[PDB]
Amino acid sequence: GSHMDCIADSKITAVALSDTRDNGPFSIRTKRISRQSAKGFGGGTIHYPTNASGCGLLGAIAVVPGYVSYENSIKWWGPRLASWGFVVITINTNSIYDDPDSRAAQLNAALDNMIADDTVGSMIDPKRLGAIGWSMGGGGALKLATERSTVRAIMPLAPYHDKSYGEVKTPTLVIACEDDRIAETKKYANAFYKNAIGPKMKVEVNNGSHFCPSYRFNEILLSKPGIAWMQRYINNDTRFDKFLCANENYSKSPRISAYDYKDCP
């Protein structure tokens, strides 16, 4: 249960988590936030569940794209996680050329936008937040984690950050791409994972390019660990423990070339 006893045990299955789009236990709606309305980011889409009132207050997650990419690179996380009970904002940045530290600031502003929003703000527990980002946006999520203690979990996807960002103790699920030639894993994802000091898990997608966790590539593959991680650490729902760390043998998947975890779940 943690904060989501409104999800029945019998719905918490690998089959249910391993699905596409808004196939999940809650129905959802969206609200568009314009670029001009957004203070500190380029606008985005808020996704929220419409029949989750039995859950009490909900966790909220901001999701940011990478370099020279727009919201559509990461938008699919919005319906996926909202149908599992989160409020989720998938954003555009001010410029597609903004760097990783700028994307951390824009994730921060997007979290604040949801918390204050006239539609979803009253549904949100502002202490239970999460962040996801691809490429330079994954770097932004790592940086944000060092700065905002109400961010309870992050999921950096093919993360790129080419400057010091500091020590991360936030629960971190790194999705790496084996054959990444932009954010080479030896320099970026593997070092970020090694240096994190809290709960942490890393799934490397076999033969993946830098695009491997973007534009709905590998959607079914990543949905189960991603939803489980966010439920475990944003909502303290240990019913998702069975899909995480030593409890789920991701290294058996022919689509996964490396699997590591520590201090979880």
UniProtKB/Swiss-Prot annotation:
Keywords: Calcium, Hydrolase, Lipid degradation, Lipid metabolism, Metal-binding. The active site is at 135 (nucleophile). It catalyses: a triacylglycerol + H2O = a diacylglycerol + a fatty acid + H(+). This is Lipase 1. The keyword Transmembrane does not apply. The gene is lip1. Ca(2+) binds at residues 260, 263. It is an enzyme of class 3 (hydrolase). The keyword Metal-binding applies. GO terms for biological process: lipid catabolic process. Active at temperatures close to 0 degree Celsius. The chain holds residues 59 to 319 of 319 of the full protein. GO terms for molecular function: metal ion binding; triacylglycerol lipase activity. It comes from the Bacteria. Its EC number is 3.1.1.3. It comes from Moraxella sp. (strain TA144).
